[PDB]
Design a protein around this ligand. Structure first.
Ligand SMILES: O=C(N[C@H]1CCS(=O)(=O)C1)c1cccs1
Ligand SMILES: [Cl-]
Ligand SMILES: [Cl-]
Ligand SMILES: [Cl-]
Length: 163
């Protein structure tokens, strides 16, 4: 584990992360997809061999020795707010189990269900809070990746508030 486990946020492409493993914001069918998923496909295409997995789950596939944890958040266009909230929390709990099993000291993670799966709603606080609930009991250094300047500021504020 990390000597003093921390949370940090960076505004940049997660495909250029400086961590020991990455979490992909995957679709259930293991397709190249869009956004983070397409960037992950271009950087680690080998990790998409048998990566299909249901909503609310995570499935790890190596690219060489580098782990890619495919986490499938719900598409809020399809689920009700109640059911989607439950599956979003579940996807993050499965990420925590995989990070622990892998024994890594750091992990790069995006905010699940905040892009094309958001159903057109701002889900920063909802997704980030489920990320904290799952990852708080792990000892890996967590680095959250985002692309928007206002989101970077809000995530950074939420991290610092708890310290
Ligand atoms: O790329 C994202 N979501 C993926 C869900 C499956 S997909 O439709 O292929 C795109 C992101 C999540 C957060 C920021 S971007
Ligand atoms: Cl970048
Ligand atoms: Cl998304
Ligand atoms: Cl963002």
């Amino acid at each position: 584990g990390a000597m003093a486990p921390s949370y940090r946020v960076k505004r940049m492409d997660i495909a250029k992360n400086d961590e020991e493993c990455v979490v992909n914001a995957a679709n259930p069918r293991g397709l190249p997809g869009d956004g983070v998923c397409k960037a992950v496909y271009k950087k680690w295409p080998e990790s998409f061999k048998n990566s299909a997995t249901p909503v609310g789950t995570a499935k790890t596939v190596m690219c060489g020795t580098y782990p890619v944890i495919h986490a499938v958040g719900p598409n809020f266009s399809n689920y009700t707010e109640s059911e989607g909230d439950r599956e979003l929390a579940a996807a993050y709990r499965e990420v925590a189990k995989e990070v622990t099993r892998l024994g890594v000291n750091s992990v790069a993670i995006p905010l699940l269900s905040t892009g094309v799966y958001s159903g057109g709603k701002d889900r920063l606080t909802q997704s980030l809070n489920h990320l904290f609930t799952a990852m708080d009991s792990t000892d890996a250094d967590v680095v959250i990746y985002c692309r928007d300047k206002e989101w970077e500021k809000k995530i950074s504020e939420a991290i610092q508030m708890r310290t």
